[model samples]
Target: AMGSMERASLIQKAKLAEQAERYEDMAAFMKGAVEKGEELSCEERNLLSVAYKNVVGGQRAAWRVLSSIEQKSNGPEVREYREKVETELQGVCDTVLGLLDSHLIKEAGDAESRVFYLKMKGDYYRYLAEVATGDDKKRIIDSARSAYQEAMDISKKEMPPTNPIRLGLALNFSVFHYEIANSPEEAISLAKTTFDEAMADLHTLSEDSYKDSTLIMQLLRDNLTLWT
Candidate 1:
């Protein structure tokens, strides 16, 4: 009963929704499984995060594009559309953040999953901060910062420098330093240090993780050069 018949069906339903690219439905199915007190395995947990991430990423992309257009057109159409996009779809991010906070992190079976979920919580909150403002923005900013900071703190102690989770977290945390935190110098140093760490540990990675780790290493290096 590891997967449980009920949960297996939900995961399969979530899988079909993902295959059809119906991410909204995918999230709901997985949400049902999680809310029903079913413990998610690695695959189920990943499917859930990815389902919501895609849905949230799409909305964020539209808002960012509209934001750029608004600077030039200043049209009420653009303004209203952007506001509508944020206000209406914003709950997707908050809800996923809630899932990560309330369930995923608590049930994470190991350090890798813990850092992964924490990184996701940080990511979704960062997405929220992209369109939020006033004191709300400040609060979300701090929330995002803490999530990333705690992930960083744990990953460094728990995972290897070459581990994909650690590398991925470093890449994202540095970007947070660059954009959200507005500390370009901090971003640069963090990226450079991570790059150095990976370079020294090139032999430490297994065949399975080599490609994944390499891609992120390039990303860290790419950001370092671009930022500097």
Candidate 2:
């Protein structure tokens, strides 16, 4: 039997690696843990599965961060790093999805677990859109849009409105509507609605200051100016 303390230690290290932007290292640990086939309780296996999922999630996020940097600084080194991150992210994405699918099949009765798989599927498509070229971009965006819409529907209907878990769906939907949609007007309008819902959620995660509100308002004002 695997030691719970040891598993937790590895998870902590993996999370630290994520924070330090060492995604490949994180992925290596996660893949090793999952593949080693150590004796583990169902709960332990689920925890390990989540750890693996988060590693891929971190890889996706790190690629996004690098890609954002590359937009502003096109240095050769940065571009090379971006390409490597993207390549690694694609592999991790596939691995994570496969693992998630296996879990979902094993635990078919778990609605909450299914939601996470859908969320990850949506995230994968969005990541694909970012690294894709030409026609690939269009296809990836289309798939992302579809998957996100499904996630939104599931989260909105099944999760309580007051639940913080739904915020990710709302925020991602806002991004999808604003950046990926073909219509800017519709996008901005949807963004405004999403902002309103985001603001309303203060009942759960209350905002003590208007700083964030002001920032959001300014963003809305700036986007609105484009129409005039």
Candidate 3:
């Protein structure tokens, strides 16, 4: 009885925090209350997911909570809420891509910035492709392929062979060819060459090389495995 009373108290505080727009506080208290056996309504769970997205970045946590709610609630309200969240998430991606596109156009000669924007564009298009349909899916995937290729071209000309950014561009560009462009032969060739070059450069790095040196090599190795 005492534990139940404590849980109810915490839940009430969580609700108050939500009303106050103290999302982080609401998430913390609500999570604790739930762990203590307080059941949350659908609206509370939705608010918690929003809190997670606002506080920590990324929608994966939000999606997990929303997906759980979706499984339990077959009502039209739940379905509409899920659709709304999905659209909101897609809007976030579109906003980022729009900013990147504007920056790329304004700073055309900055190879580094160009590579960064192109890579992000490729990533966003690939994400959109996952939820798109028919012709839209094909168009988004082709855009991803083009963005990766442009990044790879710039990186190869302006960056060192073993630079982390250059290597990553090659890795992802290889994936576009392998998985989406229907050119496995070219993908395998590029992956093998990039991995070989990256390994050769890895041996030349000083003992006190940057912390990400090992990580970059590890990712290269992982990409190689995918190609093989």
Candidate 4:
């Protein structure tokens, strides 16, 4: 009813903010739309995911670019600026991870939604691991891997192989192995296997989800091309 209207308007604003590359503003709009203990519609959840994700995404990329410059110059200004960017990146990751740990996780909707939340949880933890130090890096890696593993088990047990959520979970888990775990072989194998399995069952995908499913399949294959 009006709930949908409220979310719709917020989603529109989030999209506009995204278009402007203002992810914190986008995250704020989407975050405002979500009610505590209230289940989010699929559209709402995806918008929320995008809103928060790109904040870290942009910051991570910028931090990387800043890192190379700092390394070459030993410039205090460059190092300080990169540190400031990384700090914001850490805060955004912590805040979103907090949301998943405390809220939006226990709400029931569908397996897709459940997997979506878990995968996103894994993702934010993975982001934190990117800049973490030695012992803390190991700890963040463990938590990130566990979250992805749980999502994988649930998706494989409950979701159809061709379901976009299932395929998407596989993609991220493979990415986790490659990026955080530094297990490129494990990453390649998982991506290959999921791509093969899903291709066999892909005909079972609904036309409604057909688009998203195929899009992820292409991503899996593209990674193979890049990785192998």
Name the candidate that leads on lDDT.
4
List the candidates ranked by TM-score, beginning with the highest: 1, 4, 3, 2
| Candidate 4 vs. true structure, TM-score | 0.89
Cα error, residue 217 of model 1, in Å, equals 0.9
- List where candidate 3 sits over 4 angstroms from the true fold: 1-57, 60-82, 175-188, 208-211, 226-228
Give the C-alpha lDDT of model 4. Answer: 0.85
- Residue-level lDDT of model 4, residues 1-228, one tens digit each, is 224446667778888998998888889777767643467888778888988878778899999999899877853789789899999999998878877766777775577878899999899999889888799899999999998998898899898777888898899999999988999999999999999988888787678777778899999999999999
| lDDT of candidate 2 at residue 160, scale 0 to 100 | 51
Which candidate would rank higher by TM-score, 2 or 3?
Answer: 3
lDDT values of the candidates?
A: 0.84, 0.60, 0.66, 0.85
Which residue ranges in model 2 land beyond 4 Å of their true spot?
1-23, 31-85, 104-112, 198-228
User: Which of the two candidates, 3 or 4, achieves a greater TM-score against the reference?
Assistant: 4
Give the worst 10-residue stretch by lDDT in candidate 4: 1-10
Clashes by residue pair, model 2:
none
Instruction: Quote the positional error of residue 55 for candidate 2 in Å.
Output: 7.3
Model 2 shows how many backbone clashes?
A: 0
lDDT of 1 by residue, 32-91 (tens): 777767467778778988898888888988888988988778437889998989885678
The TM-score that candidate 1 achieves is 0.90
